[PDB]
Design an enzyme around this catalytic site. Structure first.
Site, PDB file in Angstrom:
ATOM      1  N   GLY A  25       0.826  -1.401  -0.239  1.00  0.00           N
ATOM      2  CA  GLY A  25      -0.288  -0.084   0.023  1.00  0.00           C
ATOM      3  C   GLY A  25       0.836   1.429  -0.196  1.00  0.00           C
ATOM      4  O   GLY A  25       2.094   1.294  -0.138  1.00  0.00           O
ATOM      5  N   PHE A  29       3.221   9.629   3.526  1.00  0.00           N
ATOM      6  CA  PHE A  29       4.582  10.236   4.158  1.00  0.00           C
ATOM      7  C   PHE A  29       5.418   8.809   3.248  1.00  0.00           C
ATOM      8  O   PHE A  29       6.175   9.670   2.533  1.00  0.00           O
ATOM      9  CB  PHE A  29       4.997   9.312   5.329  1.00  0.00           C
ATOM     10  CG  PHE A  29       4.343   8.034   5.304  1.00  0.00           C
ATOM     11  CD1 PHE A  29       2.592   7.949   5.039  1.00  0.00           C
ATOM     12  CD2 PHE A  29       4.941   6.443   5.017  1.00  0.00           C
ATOM     13  CE1 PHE A  29       2.120   6.167   5.247  1.00  0.00           C
ATOM     14  CE2 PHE A  29       4.379   5.113   4.670  1.00  0.00           C
ATOM     15  CZ  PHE A  29       2.812   4.858   4.871  1.00  0.00           C
ATOM     16  N   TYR A  99       6.079  -8.561   8.872  1.00  0.00           N
ATOM     17  CA  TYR A  99       5.211  -9.363   7.403  1.00  0.00           C
ATOM     18  C   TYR A  99       4.437  -9.851   8.173  1.00  0.00           C
ATOM     19  O   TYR A  99       4.107 -10.989   8.901  1.00  0.00           O
ATOM     20  CB  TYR A  99       5.592  -9.609   6.572  1.00  0.00           C
ATOM     21  CG  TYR A  99       4.593 -10.100   5.065  1.00  0.00           C
ATOM     22  CD1 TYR A  99       4.080  -8.845   4.425  1.00  0.00           C
ATOM     23  CD2 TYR A  99       4.223 -11.454   4.955  1.00  0.00           C
ATOM     24  CE1 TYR A  99       2.683  -8.911   3.894  1.00  0.00           C
ATOM     25  CE2 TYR A  99       3.009 -11.126   3.613  1.00  0.00           C
ATOM     26  CZ  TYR A  99       2.387 -10.464   3.410  1.00  0.00           C
ATOM     27  OH  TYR A  99       1.413 -10.587   2.580  1.00  0.00           O
ATOM     28  N   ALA A 100       2.915  -8.884   8.415  1.00  0.00           N
ATOM     29  CA  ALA A 100       1.914  -9.152   8.841  1.00  0.00           C
ATOM     30  C   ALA A 100       0.814 -10.200   7.534  1.00  0.00           C
ATOM     31  O   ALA A 100       0.263  -8.972   6.640  1.00  0.00           O
ATOM     32  CB  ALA A 100       1.124  -8.335   8.917  1.00  0.00           C
ATOM     33  N   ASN A 104      -4.673  -5.818   8.531  1.00  0.00           N
ATOM     34  CA  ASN A 104      -5.137  -5.383   9.663  1.00  0.00           C
ATOM     35  C   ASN A 104      -6.511  -6.103  10.100  1.00  0.00           C
ATOM     36  O   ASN A 104      -7.119  -6.518  10.114  1.00  0.00           O
ATOM     37  CB  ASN A 104      -4.922  -3.598   9.456  1.00  0.00           C
ATOM     38  CG  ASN A 104      -6.956  -3.401   8.813  1.00  0.00           C
ATOM     39  OD1 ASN A 104      -7.610  -3.696   8.891  1.00  0.00           O
ATOM     40  ND2 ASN A 104      -6.493  -2.714   7.922  1.00  0.00           N
ATOM     41  N   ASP A 143      -3.373   6.618  18.163  1.00  0.00           N
ATOM     42  CA  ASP A 143      -3.968   6.413  17.121  1.00  0.00           C
ATOM     43  C   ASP A 143      -4.048   4.835  17.621  1.00  0.00           C
ATOM     44  O   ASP A 143      -3.956   3.975  16.222  1.00  0.00           O
ATOM     45  CB  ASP A 143      -3.816   6.396  16.207  1.00  0.00           C
ATOM     46  CG  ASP A 143      -4.447   5.936  14.515  1.00  0.00           C
ATOM     47  OD1 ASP A 143      -5.296   6.155  14.759  1.00  0.00           O
ATOM     48  OD2 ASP A 143      -4.132   6.193  13.854  1.00  0.00           O
ATOM     49  N   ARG A 147      -7.373  -1.287  12.735  1.00  0.00           N
ATOM     50  CA  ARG A 147      -6.867  -0.832  11.633  1.00  0.00           C
ATOM     51  C   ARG A 147      -5.564  -0.759  11.618  1.00  0.00           C
ATOM     52  O   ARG A 147      -4.281  -0.847  10.957  1.00  0.00           O
ATOM     53  CB  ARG A 147      -6.838   0.470  10.814  1.00  0.00           C
ATOM     54  CG  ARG A 147      -6.598   1.437  11.625  1.00  0.00           C
ATOM     55  CD  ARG A 147      -6.989   2.846  11.224  1.00  0.00           C
ATOM     56  NE  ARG A 147      -6.925   4.064  12.350  1.00  0.00           N
ATOM     57  CZ  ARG A 147      -8.288   4.427  12.465  1.00  0.00           C
ATOM     58  NH1 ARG A 147      -9.387   4.024  12.413  1.00  0.00           N
ATOM     59  NH2 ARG A 147      -7.991   5.342  13.802  1.00  0.00           N
ATOM     60  N   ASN A 148      -4.437  -0.602  12.919  1.00  0.00           N
ATOM     61  CA  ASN A 148      -2.945  -0.278  13.632  1.00  0.00           C
ATOM     62  C   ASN A 148      -2.825  -1.410  14.193  1.00  0.00           C
ATOM     63  O   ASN A 148      -1.584  -1.305  14.973  1.00  0.00           O
ATOM     64  CB  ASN A 148      -2.533   0.905  14.277  1.00  0.00           C
ATOM     65  CG  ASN A 148      -3.239   2.365  13.484  1.00  0.00           C
ATOM     66  OD1 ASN A 148      -2.928   2.544  11.687  1.00  0.00           O
ATOM     67  ND2 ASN A 148      -3.721   3.686  13.824  1.00  0.00           N
ATOM     68  N   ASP A 161       2.979   1.581  13.400  1.00  0.00           N
ATOM     69  CA  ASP A 161       2.519   2.524  13.714  1.00  0.00           C
ATOM     70  C   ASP A 161       2.982   3.566  15.003  1.00  0.00           C
ATOM     71  O   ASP A 161       2.696   4.449  14.971  1.00  0.00           O
ATOM     72  CB  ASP A 161       1.397   3.256  13.033  1.00  0.00           C
ATOM     73  CG  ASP A 161       1.390   3.076  11.640  1.00  0.00           C
ATOM     74  OD1 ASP A 161       2.907   2.987  10.986  1.00  0.00           O
ATOM     75  OD2 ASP A 161       0.388   3.691  10.963  1.00  0.00           O
TER      76      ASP A 161
HETATM   77  C1  LIG Z   1      -4.444  -6.490   0.989  1.00  0.00           C
HETATM   78  C2  LIG Z   1      -4.150  -8.204   1.369  1.00  0.00           C
HETATM   79  N1  LIG Z   1      -4.415  -8.637   2.238  1.00  0.00           N
HETATM   80  C3  LIG Z   1      -4.811  -9.686   3.291  1.00  0.00           C
HETATM   81  C4  LIG Z   1      -5.436  -9.330   4.407  1.00  0.00           C
HETATM   82  C5  LIG Z   1      -2.729  -8.954   3.159  1.00  0.00           C
HETATM   83  C6  LIG Z   1      -1.791  -7.726   3.576  1.00  0.00           C
HETATM   84  C7  LIG Z   1      -0.654  -7.834   3.719  1.00  0.00           C
HETATM   85  C8  LIG Z   1      -0.675  -6.844   4.520  1.00  0.00           C
HETATM   86  N2  LIG Z   1       0.679  -6.653   5.052  1.00  0.00           N
HETATM   87  C9  LIG Z   1       1.760  -6.329   6.310  1.00  0.00           C
HETATM   88  N3  LIG Z   1       2.370  -6.759   7.001  1.00  0.00           N
HETATM   89  C10 LIG Z   1       3.156  -5.046   7.773  1.00  0.00           C
HETATM   90  C11 LIG Z   1       3.490  -3.910   7.486  1.00  0.00           C
HETATM   91  C12 LIG Z   1       4.031  -3.557   8.186  1.00  0.00           C
HETATM   92  C13 LIG Z   1       3.795  -2.166   8.179  1.00  0.00           C
HETATM   93  C14 LIG Z   1       4.909  -1.386   8.632  1.00  0.00           C
HETATM   94  C15 LIG Z   1       5.602  -0.510   8.150  1.00  0.00           C
HETATM   95  C16 LIG Z   1       6.363  -0.066   8.630  1.00  0.00           C
HETATM   96  O1  LIG Z   1       7.447   1.255   8.902  1.00  0.00           O
HETATM   97  C17 LIG Z   1       8.364   1.584   9.709  1.00  0.00           C
HETATM   98  C18 LIG Z   1       6.000   0.475  10.703  1.00  0.00           C
HETATM   99  C19 LIG Z   1       4.917  -0.712  10.721  1.00  0.00           C
HETATM  100  O2  LIG Z   1       4.357  -0.267  12.178  1.00  0.00           O
HETATM  101  C20 LIG Z   1       5.385   1.134  13.267  1.00  0.00           C
HETATM  102  C21 LIG Z   1       4.245  -1.314  10.752  1.00  0.00           C
HETATM  103  C22 LIG Z   1       3.265  -1.491   7.243  1.00  0.00           C
HETATM  104  N4  LIG Z   1       2.691  -0.296   6.743  1.00  0.00           N
HETATM  105  C23 LIG Z   1       1.814   0.015   6.078  1.00  0.00           C
HETATM  106  O3  LIG Z   1       1.757   1.762   6.473  1.00  0.00           O
HETATM  107  N5  LIG Z   1       0.873   0.300   5.337  1.00  0.00           N
HETATM  108  C24 LIG Z   1       0.397   0.499   4.615  1.00  0.00           C
HETATM  109  C25 LIG Z   1      -0.411  -1.125   3.252  1.00  0.00           C
HETATM  110  C26 LIG Z   1      -0.955   0.691   5.125  1.00  0.00           C
HETATM  111  C27 LIG Z   1       0.898   0.795   3.458  1.00  0.00           C
HETATM  112  N6  LIG Z   1       1.836  -2.397   6.319  1.00  0.00           N
HETATM  113  C28 LIG Z   1       2.491  -3.753   6.578  1.00  0.00           C
HETATM  114  N7  LIG Z   1       1.742  -4.918   5.029  1.00  0.00           N
END
Ligand SMILES: CCN(CC)CCCCNc1ncc2cc(-c3cc(OC)cc(OC)c3)c(NC(=O)NC(C)(C)C)nc2n1
Ligand SMILES: CCN(CC)CCCCNc1ncc2cc(-c3cc(OC)cc(OC)c3)c(NC(=O)NC(C)(C)C)nc2n1
Lengths: 272, 274
Positions: A25, A29, A99-100, A104, A143, A147-148, A161
């Site tokens: 996504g 930022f 990776y998640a 969310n 926040d 979602r977070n 976040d």
């Molecule tokens: C969309 C399809 N489905 C099915 C439900 C799978 C999606 C899998 C999403 N997998 C994923 N796994 C880890 C992620 C971690 C961050 C993240 C990055 C950071 O950087 C320093 C910090 C942080 O915590 C402090 C978290 C993130 N960040 C993010 O802003 N993501 C979006 C998409 C909103 C832009 N996204 C993540 N997504």
């Protein structure tokens, strides 16, 4: 900084060991993309990589660095999205995190309307742990919301976040998660996060439900001033509902702490 | 100017007018010979126009034709000759169903009491439906409760859908929140749109006088409605009664159940309810 980022051998990962992939996504930022790191000594690990967008500014960089540094100060915990590595030298900055695979919690909970009564409380417990941890590290999320919270392949809730450096910007309104003191008095505390956690609990027991649907900002402030509190969700004990109301107590000192919440929920998960 | 009617007239001297209810005043009617009966009396205001006198008479005549039924505010009589028009109707000591419900919220009514309350409303509505009457504003506010806890539908023969103000509140609530989408957007009122309203009323019974869509303004309500939004299941309410609620809010008018059906189901549930 402008020409070269600060060096830190501890986190640095050789760019050749990282293979960028399908973007997850984006946002104001920067940008997050799926990737495959090697030897975080020759095994591939899937990770999420945050980085600046091509239209970024020195301040945008400064914010991404601060976010990385903060994750560094905070430390590791099973219930938060952890820092795994970073490409800072000779090229654009890459903040490599966990990776998640199941996105969310909101999306997670909706695609499964199949979790068990224990599972819903188990999920709430894991979010409370992570918060207790972040709080023990002096961290104020500001926040907290489903979602977070990101969920791994093995269903591990991970606060996201928490290290991030318009009341009308959406497509839900984040103000709906805000504690009255943080929303009226700009007073952000660990206790205000406890308010937001209540609204999160409700999201868990409504399986991705949207709080105050159709209620605009002006109207929200009015319900808040009138002492109105969301109704108790169907499929949710009066006990879990007291906990939500507890977290929504006007007096911040009267709301329970994340340590207490972790305790109550520990017990409840067992008595479920 | 008002035509006498031997069928309902009561000598003005037989009406012991009392405390104002909110214009409707409580009153005692002697006879109806040596016995007094508490009744409610509707009369015009000082600044009431000749239009207001038309509607008032209409409401009476409508009540005259509709006939009696246990679950509706029945007409008891009228004082039309020599003086102000007094429309004597049944008295509901316990006030409307919303108040009744709220004033019994824990810091009580059983599950069977609540389900039995919906049954009686449904019967009130069923009779009114059998008599070709469409209510248009069916809500807990428009249901009164007698000392015996009998549910009685009020304001059914009430006197313009093309002159209704959507941005007007009640206790500070928007009546549009009880309106079916087609009655709100297409101005089409039927027994079916009354069924949508009974579903909202059902939701108020199980939430003990809960307010539909808190903080939701008219403009935002239209949006929820256009998107096909439906309120969540009240806590402490079965999936069966939530289902009934949901069926009352069926998008397609012809698909919602009838009051005759509702009465049959509620009657089966009451019997099964704890
Ligand atoms: C969309 C399809 N489905 C099915 C439900 C799978 C999606 C899998 C999403 N997998 C994923 N796994 C880890 C992620 C971690 C961050 C993240 C990055 C950071 O950087 C320093 C910090 C942080 O915590 C402090 C978290 C993130 N960040 C993010 O802003 N993501 C979006 C998409 C909103 C832009 N996204 C993540 N997504
Ligand atoms: C402290 C709680 N306490 C407040 C005193 C109890 C309140 C009890 C109210 N007891 C009552 N009992 C019968 C009523 C009947 C009507 C009524 C009159 C009609 O006239 C032709 C037609 C009709 O339907 C067909 C119903 C009515 N009408 C009404 O508009 N009432 C308000 C107050 C809203 C102005 N009110 C009534 N109230």
């Amino acid at each position: 900084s402008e020409y070269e980022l600060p060096e830190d051998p501890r986190w640095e990962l050789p760019r050749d060991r990282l293979v960028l992939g399908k973007p997850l996504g984006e946002g104001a930022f920067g940008q997050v993309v799926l990737a495959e790191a090697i030897g975080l000594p020759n095994r591939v690990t899937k990770v999420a990589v945050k980085m600046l967008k091509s239209d970024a500014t020195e301040k945008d960089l400064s914010d991404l660095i601060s976010e990385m540094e903060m994750m560094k100060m905070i430390g590791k915990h099973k219930n938060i999205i952890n820092l795994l590595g970073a490409c800072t030298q000779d090229g654009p900055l890459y903040v490599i995190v966990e990776y998640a695979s199941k996105g969310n919690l909101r999306e997670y909970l909706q695609a499964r309307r199949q979790l068990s009564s224990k599972d819903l409380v188990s999920c709430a417990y894991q979010v409370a742990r992570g918060m207790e941890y972040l709080a023990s590290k002096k961290c104020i999320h500001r926040d907290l919301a489903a979602r977070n919270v990101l969920v791994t392949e093995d269903n591990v809730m991970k606060i996201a976040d928490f290290g991030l450096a318009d009341y009308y910007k959406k497509g839900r309104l984040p103000v709906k998660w805000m504690a009255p003191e943080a929303l009226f008095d700009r007073i952000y505390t660990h206790q205000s996060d406890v308010w937001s956690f209540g609204v999160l609990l409700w999201e868990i027991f409504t399986l991705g439900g949207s709080p105050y649907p159709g209620v605009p900002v002006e109207e929200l402030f009015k319900l808040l001033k009138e002492g109105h509190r969301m109704d108790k969700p169907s499929n949710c004990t009066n006990e879990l509902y007291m906990m939500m109301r507890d977290c929504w107590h006007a007096v911040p000192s009267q709301r329970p702490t994340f340590k207490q919440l972790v305790e109550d929920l520990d017990r409840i998960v067992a008595l479920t």
